[PDB]
Amino acid sequence: KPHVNVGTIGHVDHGKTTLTAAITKILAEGGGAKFKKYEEIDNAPEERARGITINAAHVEYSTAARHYAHTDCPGHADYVKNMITGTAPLDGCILVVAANDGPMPQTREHLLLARQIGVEHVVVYVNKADAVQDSEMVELVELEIRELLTEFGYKGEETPIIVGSALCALEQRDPELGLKSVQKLLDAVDTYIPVPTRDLEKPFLLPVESVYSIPGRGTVVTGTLERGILKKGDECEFLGHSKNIRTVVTGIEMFHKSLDRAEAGDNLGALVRGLKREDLRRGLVMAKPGSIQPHQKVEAQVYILTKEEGGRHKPFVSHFMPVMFSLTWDMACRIILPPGKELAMPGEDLKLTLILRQPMILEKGQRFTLRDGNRTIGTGLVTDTPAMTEEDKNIKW
Amino acid sequence: KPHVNVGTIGHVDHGKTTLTAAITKILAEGGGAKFKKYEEIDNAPEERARGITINAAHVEYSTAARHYAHTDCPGHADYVKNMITGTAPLDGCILVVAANDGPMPQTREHLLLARQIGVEHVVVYVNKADAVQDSEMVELVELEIRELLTEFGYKGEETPIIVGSALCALEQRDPELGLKSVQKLLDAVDTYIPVPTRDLEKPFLLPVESVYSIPGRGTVVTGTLERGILKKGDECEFLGHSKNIRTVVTGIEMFHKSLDRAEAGDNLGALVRGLKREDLRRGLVMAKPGSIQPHQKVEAQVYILTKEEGGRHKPFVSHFMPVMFSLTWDMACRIILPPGKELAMPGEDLKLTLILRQPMILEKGQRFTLRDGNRTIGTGLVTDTPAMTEEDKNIKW
Amino acid sequence: KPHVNVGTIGHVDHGKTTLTAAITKILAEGGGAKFKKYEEIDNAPEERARGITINAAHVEYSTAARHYAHTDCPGHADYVKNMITGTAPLDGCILVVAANDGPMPQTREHLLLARQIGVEHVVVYVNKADAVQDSEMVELVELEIRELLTEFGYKGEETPIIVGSALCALEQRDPELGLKSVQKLLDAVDTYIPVPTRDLEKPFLLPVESVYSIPGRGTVVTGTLERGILKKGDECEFLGHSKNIRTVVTGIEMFHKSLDRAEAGDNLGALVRGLKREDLRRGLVMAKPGSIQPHQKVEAQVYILTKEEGGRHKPFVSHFMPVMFSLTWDMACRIILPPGKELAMPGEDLKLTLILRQPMILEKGQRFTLRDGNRTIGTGLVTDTPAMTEEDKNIKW
Amino acid sequence: KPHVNVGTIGHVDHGKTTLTAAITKILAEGGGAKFKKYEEIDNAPEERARGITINAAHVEYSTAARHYAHTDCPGHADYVKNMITGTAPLDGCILVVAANDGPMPQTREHLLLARQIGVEHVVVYVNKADAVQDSEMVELVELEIRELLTEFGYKGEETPIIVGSALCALEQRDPELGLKSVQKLLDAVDTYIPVPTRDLEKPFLLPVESVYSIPGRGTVVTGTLERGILKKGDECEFLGHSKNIRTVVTGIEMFHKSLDRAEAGDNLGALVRGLKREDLRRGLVMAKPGSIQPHQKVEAQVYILTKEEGGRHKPFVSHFMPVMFSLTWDMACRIILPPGKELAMPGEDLKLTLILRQPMILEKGQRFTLRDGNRTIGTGLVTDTPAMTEEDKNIKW
Ligand SMILES: Nc1nc2c(ncn2[C@@H]2O[C@H](COP(=O)(O)OP(=O)(O)O)[C@@H](O)[C@H]2O)c(=O)[nH]1
Ligand SMILES: Nc1nc2c(ncn2[C@@H]2O[C@H](COP(=O)(O)OP(=O)(O)O)[C@@H](O)[C@H]2O)c(=O)[nH]1
Ligand SMILES: Nc1nc2c(ncn2[C@@H]2O[C@H](COP(=O)(O)OP(=O)(O)O)[C@@H](O)[C@H]2O)c(=O)[nH]1
Ligand SMILES: Nc1nc2c(ncn2[C@@H]2O[C@H](COP(=O)(O)OP(=O)(O)O)[C@@H](O)[C@H]2O)c(=O)[nH]1
Ligand SMILES: [Mg+2]
Ligand SMILES: [Mg+2]
Ligand SMILES: [Mg+2]
Numbered sequence A, B, C, D: 001k002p003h004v005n006v007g008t009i010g011h012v013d014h015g016k017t018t019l020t021a022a023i024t025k026i027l028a029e030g031g032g033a034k035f036k037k038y039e040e041i042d043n044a045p046e047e048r049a050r051g052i053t054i055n056a057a058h059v060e061y062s063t064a065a066r067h068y069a070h071t072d073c074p075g076h077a078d079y080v081k082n083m084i085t086g087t088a089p090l091d092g093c094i095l096v097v098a099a100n101d102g103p104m105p106q107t108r109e110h111l112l113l114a115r116q117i118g119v120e121h122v123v124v125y126v127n128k129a130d131a132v133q134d135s136e137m138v139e140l141v142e143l144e145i146r147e148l149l150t151e152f153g154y155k156g157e158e159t160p161i162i163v164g165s166a167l168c169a170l171e172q173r174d175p176e177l178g179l180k181s182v183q184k185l186l187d188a189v190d191t192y193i194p195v196p197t198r199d200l201e202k203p204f205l206l207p208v209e210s211v212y213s214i215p216g217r218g219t220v221v222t223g224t225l226e227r228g229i230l231k232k233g234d235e236c237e238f239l240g241h242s243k244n245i246r247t248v249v250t251g252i253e254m255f256h257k258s259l260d261r262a263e264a265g266d267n268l269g270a271l272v273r274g275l276k277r278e279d280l281r282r283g284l285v286m287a288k289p290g291s292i293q294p295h296q297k298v299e300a301q302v303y304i305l306t307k308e309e310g311g312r313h314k315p316f317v318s319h320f321m322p323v324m325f326s327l328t329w330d331m332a333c334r335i336i337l338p339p340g341k342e343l344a345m346p347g348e349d350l351k352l353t354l355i356l357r358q359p360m361i362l363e364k365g366q367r368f369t370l371r372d373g374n375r376t377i378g379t380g381l382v383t384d385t386p387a388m389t390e391e392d393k394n395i396k397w
């Protein structure tokens, strides 16, 4: 069946793990010798991805329509890092909000992060409906949630909100609160969360990994199509490093065979017309003409690694100038702390403003790492590509 | 129940009006029903919108779930002008493709136009299935349409494609091809085409209509919130006329009453901190900080008005410099004709590249008119905001 | 007295009309008929049926046992046209063969036609016995006739053969040859030619004349039961137009009353379970399931109308495509002329092969007309139902 | 004396055997139809028709006008299997109906089988008139029987119905009910039941037994002409294995001599023009062009043999592909238990739908066997040739 990656988000102690466990138990009830229990998921593995350690539980379960890869994390820190470091792909989120607590600070942070990483669809599970002494408490929280969703870019009025008790469901009790709510939840997830797509419909985008030439045929740029479809003869535009080159792809090569087309995910060699090897370089991005434009200024959510993770031992102030690695390029940039913030502490995550020396393909949602010296000092997510201020372009380098 | 605006699109003679008539007839079966017949719909009345005449038929029908306003136009020129002019809202399109003919030129243009004007979802009706013997043909056409959808930005694999005969449906015969296809079509419309929204979850955006001052209180900008929600105390940013002014909305007023918030559709006066009346002007756009960026170069589908439509008398050539009006602003721009067109054919639409003298809010899907002197010679839609090339700078006036 | 439709057949000048006149003469004595002189019967009135003109004399006479409607026609062409169109229904035929001339071409053609239209009983009158020198001739002709009878499907051995002189009978002379032979002929007719039946034991067959709906009850098809018995609750199948629809007849209505059954000859409305108006159309035949199979190709003896009969003025060639009308249906068909035949001349009858665009109920013995636009150009009788050939199926309409 | 195959049919205990015995006496007394007593007959000589067990009692007796091969079977199962396998050919049937019981289930089932096997003539013996007091009971039973006959396609109005007591005739008492009734029965039997005929008038049909070549002369197919007449020069068509080949019989060989014609029952060698040995194969049927059409779907009354008879010791579901043998061909088929039936128990007969991977000559009334491995799991009789559903066609073997 179609595969979908989802995850429970929401403030600590609201029931994310209980829901996840209840889901695995309910769906694995149609016969099953082994399925992850609460405790087994509450204490999840530690995945060291690029020096950063994040405790995350990954369970799999299937509905009558889709196979799901579900991640649940023990603490808020795991979510922040995980969502910013783009370790676990995500097509949709199950926002768990304990009825008796209502949206909490982490509830909002996760929503922001889910929005910023590209999640456009969320399903809300108002958990702990068993511990509620007022049905008034429920109707009120749903309203607050829909407004919260809209506040964070989601269609609050369209978002499915299921009310129930993940606990009752996990301990197979009071079906109207437990089992039923979870079924209603899974149904909402099957219908509201879109199935992943290789985004073949978006303008092709190919980060140039390398360049080479074949005597007698021309210059070839290699790379993996991150999205769209590249067709032989298609017009292309290379962007980055303060340059814009418009030409045509006269040939596509994969597995030593000439092809008429390549699609997102294909590692290919694109033969381009007229251009010579010195005209191109790793770092440029070949895209459908006019589909994207380089950005030199960006706002990004950035996790600053701790010394343990191999990052900085001390904080840094505005105008700190590490080198940003994103896609296949690397570019020097200047970090600008938010108003107030005088120091950027290691282990801390914040919304930073980054200005690259030269405009590069830096799309919203695009991930990057910051390196100073030979170590990674931060990992981030582009959240906005604000307009370069008059003072910004008057920056020194 | 929910109201949704839809319309049939596709190449002439593929069955758009027959399908429309079939739908009305079928949904007319019982209740307080008075439906329009083929002839009535085919002989679409003309309508004038800002000096531009268009033959368009409008019918209404409701499924069990929604009410629909449906637009069907006789000729291709009708759709081109109607979709570029932005006369009415379009939440979804019903792309009609005749099975024997397969996708044709107008099939492509309408899809592109639909995507450009903002239609995110279309449902496809492969018509005239009755006129085919080889289901082999139909299968190929469906595959072809899915690639076509993907080619134009729509999720081809996800798009509902219904095969049938609008004629059999209209003439109440061969139900598997007729009635049942129409029922499947309407279901798909009900489920795949989103209900309109006021986009309250999007970043607030307020095109400034005017500016005034209240002694002892401050400067006020007036305008109608185009999307999102504005709250008293919200940080805001004015964009346009090469200016980036960031401040805060300290007061929102409507009906001579102060408000804590306003949302899309509200015509309001927004009191802003610090700024003076000379610091602002009609044409600027007040938006959530960093949400949008002004553009100076844009690609657009532009309809060149006819001489009798009040358009220009002499077709203009590349580098013509009309004045662009969009939102509440006006700005000089330079036009660059498409590669392959030496002149802007009157009464014809084309893909122009326009460069504004100054960056202004010009979002994709945004409409604008081009005026030469006091007369409008073209009305367009932003389709892309390409990277401003070094050459595009060197151009003067 | 039961009623039987009979008629004389046989070669021109063999004595059909004289015999017919002799019969009325002999029966007029006892008041079982009004004597019609040879001259009155010979100068047969011209009649017009669906434009087709044929001269036929109709006389009525009664034997003590039955009442008879006797048809006698002047020329071979009248017989051919009459039998192909079935203008004068025949329950049995009196084959007249002149002993002095023996079986002739038309003797064979009439027996063949008689067989093809469903006549199963023929009594023979070997006429002009007064002109045969001896029995050898007669005895030999009789033998030849019985053999001929068997050659065309009849039981030559059981078939009554009366020898005599219709002329002697008519002129009341030579009692043995005349009077006695005619009385013997009539006795044989009374005995060997069975009274007509409604074929109530045959599988019911109801050509659908129209379809209508009764709110709260369902879809009703109307038509005249051509044969068999239809009972409420009976399973039925609708055949034709490449449709295979099986259901049950849940109601039978005639004279605005609900009936439990109807019989051949009844014009009724059959309420059929589950089907909607869209499922059915005039032209389909409702029949006992599996009782009949639609045919798409047939051989038929076809009379091509002259322009005076409203037909074509010019001959047509092989592959001509009129529309065949039979029972309550109409269907395009392609005509294939006989081997050698290069032109179908108006006023000519010939064996044609017709292939329908779609299989329809078209049985051997079934009649049809061929129309080109608004005029009937041919009227035919199905004589065989050959299976479709590979190239036949590969017909382009 | 002419020979006519006959047998009694009717519900159990209605007096079939008694009537049989009563028959062997009345004719063995006068002449030498040597009677066999009730017990002899009642305990019929169990016969085997290809493993298939059939307790059938055979008896011969003659009437001054004919010799008869009369068969009587103990249980319902015997008749079903006997008629389905056609082990004992029937030119006519003697339907026994207890006048006190009237038509019962088996009475109807036997009439249907009789019709399904081609029996066109039945004589009815209303038995046990001695057990009935009122004459109304009787006349009512006769009316019911005539309705029953008509219901099954027989001419209920002309079918001879004899009332009496087979027990009285047998025990020679009450001549009116006994003797005189059986005398009336036999007279009706001699009169109503016609004499068979090889049928030399239908389109020649030659199931191909084998193929061989005569170098310098051509390909020869051998087989016994099942019907019609084949003449040298006649055009022919090979049907089966979806290979429609047409040609001409350039030679006929029987008894090592070249003949001009051959007729039904003749085992011959047919030399066909142009075709090569590879072009033909056993199993194909050579027939007059268009005279017959291959069938890939069929409904049939199939008897599922019992393990004792060699059938699959277990029942089979609607999804089973045994191999079907009929005429000289063999073909894999998919059995489709009718909607409702979930299994096919051995020893049980039922209407089945059969889909052959290829269109073979399988006419209604044609017999076949079904095999699993080298075991015959069922024997059947084709009763209907339904159209292939677009579903049936999309069948993968
Ligand atoms: N009463 C009640 N307690 C619940 C429910 N769901 C979870 N809990 C309890 O709340 C605590 C935190 O739940 P847990 O799933 O670990 O929260 P997480 O941090 O979001 O994963 C545990 O003590 C759970 O047993 C519920 O529906 N009702
Ligand atoms: N055979 C067939 N003709 C159709 C069907 N739908 C429409 N048509 C015919 O196609 C022609 C054009 O249809 P119309 O609805 O006016 O096309 P439009 O130009 O797309 O509006 C008319 O002659 C219709 O009767 C269909 O399902 N089958
Ligand atoms: N000698 C003789 N002539 C006869 C007899 N019956 C008819 N004819 C003559 O044969 C001719 C044709 O007879 P008619 O009845 O018109 O033949 P039809 O064409 O078959 O109707 C006339 O001249 C009749 O008088 C008969 O029994 N004997
Ligand atoms: N009263 C009466 N009994 C009869 C008559 N014919 C047969 N029976 C009885 O009915 C029973 C069944 O008859 P049988 O010939 O075995 O029936 P079958 O199964 O149709 O062969 C036996 O007990 C017979 O004695 C009859 O004319 N009158
Ligand atoms: Mg947890
Ligand atoms: Mg139209
Ligand atoms: Mg005459």
Ligand SMILES: [Mg+2]
Pocket: D013, D016, D017, D018, D042, D073, D074, D075
């Ligand atoms: Mg018995």
